[model samples]
Target: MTADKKAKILATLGPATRSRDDIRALVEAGANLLRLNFSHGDYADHAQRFAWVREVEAELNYPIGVLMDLQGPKLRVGRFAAGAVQLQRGQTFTLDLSDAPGDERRVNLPHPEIIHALEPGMSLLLDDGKIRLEVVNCHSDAIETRVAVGGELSDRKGVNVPEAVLQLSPLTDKDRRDLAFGLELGVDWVALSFVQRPEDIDEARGLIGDKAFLMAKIEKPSAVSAIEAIAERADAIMVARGDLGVEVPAESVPGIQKRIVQVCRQLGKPVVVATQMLESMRFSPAPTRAEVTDVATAVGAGADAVMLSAETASGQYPREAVEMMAKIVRQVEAEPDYHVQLEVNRPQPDATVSDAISCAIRRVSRILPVAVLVNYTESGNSTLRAARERPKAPILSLTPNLRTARRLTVAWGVYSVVNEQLAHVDEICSTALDIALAQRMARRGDTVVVTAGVPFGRPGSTNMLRIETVAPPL
Candidate 1:
């Protein structure tokens, strides 16, 4: 492995990396997973990208994961009469449910649900929050506001409601269609954007059911408020700082991101810190010093992954971005304090056999020269639990099911490999060591900690742990 850091890189796919060679280069440059933004691509585009990833995975013999990110409810204003308008501070502006073209004084809000949810004193952000308005009066079909911060109000600009948890599904009609396509496409993970509440996760889960793991993007104040609950329900959490920074105070985003990572770690769920980690890398060959600190902070926070959006998707230096991200992660992880930090923030184990075993495996590695931690899982939860501990040893997650192996590609420190199911513990240990040797995660005479459910091939039955050294094979 070129980079063996626990914190993985998630690169977004786009025209920049559409070719199979680009995909291979991205994986070689340290991108563990790829994201398909459903908001941008068509079915054919998605199909081609998915096929390219799988083909690259086969050529490299690596399990690369693909996550489908749904562009959740994008609330925007309707077009203006002149295509654009300028609003001055303290100017009166009205947002009404009218189809008529708007001017400087008023514009069509179009979304009644949002207008209905608004109240006096609530701030409305327009044009990606470049323009801000405070609601002065609320009417049955309109909202009268005073522009607190003013700029150009162009056609179909987006709106952000930071204060109110507007009654809406995180999934829109377009998102549903996208999700249907993703499900049919067999993605490893589904990232739901604009997730406001835990119930939104439940709704998406109803549609997803076991086909793929659900990832709830924490981009709203409401989502942040009830973060633990949402994290508990969803399979994974993503601290989406783009819309979140615009909706709330930008300063709060840093704290919220760490908090989200902490919570996901506590719950033994994977957390990805995403959006603009290397924005400058999108245009330049290198990132600013502050961007380096930001990426290091996420790595230090024990985040499972840090993602890149436009940097790899539509950037000028796609390969350099991934390479730099991996370099930063490795540098942070090599710090001696980084290990101490992860240990201090380690989560306490639950009252389950799985938790007990995973916890023991983590502790055992500390006491011995455990070269690698290998766990056999059917549903990938056992491996995920082990990864949650942020153990000092690398993890080799061996699963009989290919889907589980692919799903675990996003987990921290887990190098997933689909292995054939073995019946007995003796067979399992030998196989574990054999596979570990092939992966180069362990060498002869190296101690490897192995864990698996007794009777094997059963879900949620992690009742065995055997500490053994790699011996000469037959």
Candidate 2:
């Protein structure tokens, strides 16, 4: 079987990787998807980067995927005096809504919408739990938060209100504006951050229409509770470990990530494992063995893609980091355990269509000795199911869309091809074999497993499966 080349390597773009050369370097180093993090940059900053990515794509002819991630309604602390102030053990810090000019120790928390959401005794952690506060009194004008446990308060520190369920809509004014801007930029995918419900994805979808793919970043505990419903609505799901690890128990992140990946796999939706994979490599030339193993674990676990945050965005050795990540993925993938893990842990879907297709792919794979198992997909569900079954062969996806193509670039043993469309099941099968033949990926006699839907052009309707061989025209 031919190797699946559709799986992706996703890297976030930031100040360090803002240049065209840097973008090209990462692409060359195996980045199939370039994620524009809206959490950091403004619309203009990302606009220029988006344009530069297109330039690189033209230069390299790789047709890379560009994904824009919305910051969402970020809950943050107000400014403090002089930009920061160390809190004493017994001192009380009040989050009062003051009209006074801002500094660091106490900044005004500007989101009035979420103020009403706060309840007494609800603990809020700021800057990844560095500072802690408990809501004492909730008012429209101010929510008094006494310093429950405080270290130092800085300007604009992030606020985490777990289980509070902020009153504001998931999409903020900034996010809506950003989404409008992203649509204009023609991004391949739009990733919504801190998605807590299925409605968040629906809102994004309604706003973007069919212009780009919608990926929900499952970072909150609410998102975990709503995982299945969210997966049913979202085009893709990202295992955003940073906030997730902070919001939930650190030890629980691994299990949660696995759960998210397996669920997405069962649905055949593209799933990404993101955040701090090889974080230490930001400064060091070489990655820590644990980081190497972590990247491999994501690969071996059957995630459609593994993402790099600071490792590629602001790392000192960005290119080296990406290159090292790819090398680690390749090496880990070569292990026998890699294939078995991908197969064993995948959660099966409840939907009949999903089950039948998954079963057919596995059965055909066992029958075909040496060929890539190819799937024509728009949502990448079928490809993931085939991948999850742990077939010894590579899972190749022929997709008409760039988001799925770029997003899937990270899955194990899966190769993604971005095409305009596949007209029929026969056409899909033929194209799969033809691509293998053209790339010298497979010989004419080699068998291949192909799956797709009939009447031929509906997304998420993969109801057919076939085992075919790469053959010449008679």
Candidate 3:
């Protein structure tokens, strides 16, 4: 079964929803991709959820994708003398390597990288930018700052250094361990967090190899500056607006999101617009008007997927939130203006055979009443190219590789199914026709466009496109 909408839904599993039934409900509600946020839960918690996901996948006969989101090098301050300390505005604050519990005067900054990289006049945001500190002095082991904005300096509150390109690795020890566990669990994707530069993507790629797709989480200004290079390296890109909005001006996030989506689309990479799309759903049954528009805007911008974080993770209404999100996406996609928006915002295809096939498919569908576009792929590259075109007709991506089929669950408008590799071109077409008819994807005599490599089984060789009518059931 597939979601009715084109823009896919990614739901995070947490305390609120863990059982097999709940996971099934979420998938049935329209979650194409299930996310295991490694930041919060232990390995056992994640393994349990992963097992439940597989069970649901087996029961439903659906290839749902699992994304292992690693909590990368999340910098934070050390403990306080009392559980928390109130700091006054304009007070001096010092973050050092001292093991002593801190008072209003100073706190222990556990991350030596942040301390060593500090420079005078640089700004440091603490507690999600609630308490802003301006560096007045930087030493080998300490950073002295004047509070620009102050509040309760609680224990282990997060630290954000927007100016400094940190020397720290994107994958922390925790993240490495988490990555090992996730890969062992057979996750489809790994979203690396706090990516500062292109090198961060390379670093993660070294470990990931070809085991799973690497999705770079763009949350820092440094990432935005080098987004083009980073997108080139990453298999996908996620606009993690939580810390991004904290690091950059909140007003700028909308524009940045649009830019990031466009960049990813241009490169034929899947992009997920995540964080706070349905924040109000965490507590209330309904989302705010702005939240509805926020989701619509992302859909209108042609993002591959829009994610629900707290809305599905720890929300009071996980099912309702998912249902609402799916509803909103369907309504937005159905709008006449939505199609117009897609066509207008559609990226120009590159001068390549694969791109030519994608362009031809879109043109052919408009000329004829094509029921569906049948994509024969090995590595899922051709399917993604077709998806990037955002064709009106649904895409049925037939693959011999089950892993490739599962990974396409997150791509927009693509329905994936595993088929045995056929030797001849005629067998491939007949197989496509049989599967399409069996799945009720296309009626007999309906037109179907099949695109695949001429040499068959060769990955990324989208060199042929054939238009034919579906024959009667054999």
Candidate 3 per-residue lDDT, tens place, 7-61, comes to 8899999989868899999988888999999989777888999999999888887
Per-residue accuracy of model 2 over 225-337 as CA lDDT, tens digit each: 88999999977888888778778779988998877777887666778888878889889999888888787777766776878888887878889888887788778766766
Cα error, candidate 1, residue 36 (Å): 1.0
lDDT of 2: 0.74
Which model is ahead, 2 or 3, in terms of TM-score? Answer: 3
- Candidate 1 residue-wise lDDT, 1-474, digit = tens: 533677889999987876988899998888998999888867898899899998998888767889999988888998899987888999898988987788898888778899776779989998888989999999988889999998878999999999999888888999999989999988989999888889999999999988999999998899999998999999999888887889888888888987888888898899999987999988899899999998899888989989999999898999999999999999998899888878778877778888888777767876889988887777888788788778888888887778888888889988888756776666878788888878877878889988887777565647788999877765
What range of 10 consecutive residues in model 2 has the weakest lDDT sum?
98-107
Report every candidate's CA lDDT: 0.86, 0.74, 0.86
Off by over 4 Å in 2: 1-7, 18-21, 41-45, 56-62, 81-83, 90-92, 100-108, 137-140, 144-146, 348-354, 377-390, 399-413, 418-432, 457-464, 470-474
Off by over 4 Å in 3: 457-460, 471-474
Instruction: Judge candidate 3 against the unseen true structure and give its global Cα lDDT, from 0 to 1.
Output: 0.86
RMSD of each: 1.6, 3.6, 1.7
TM-score of each: 0.96, 0.86, 0.96
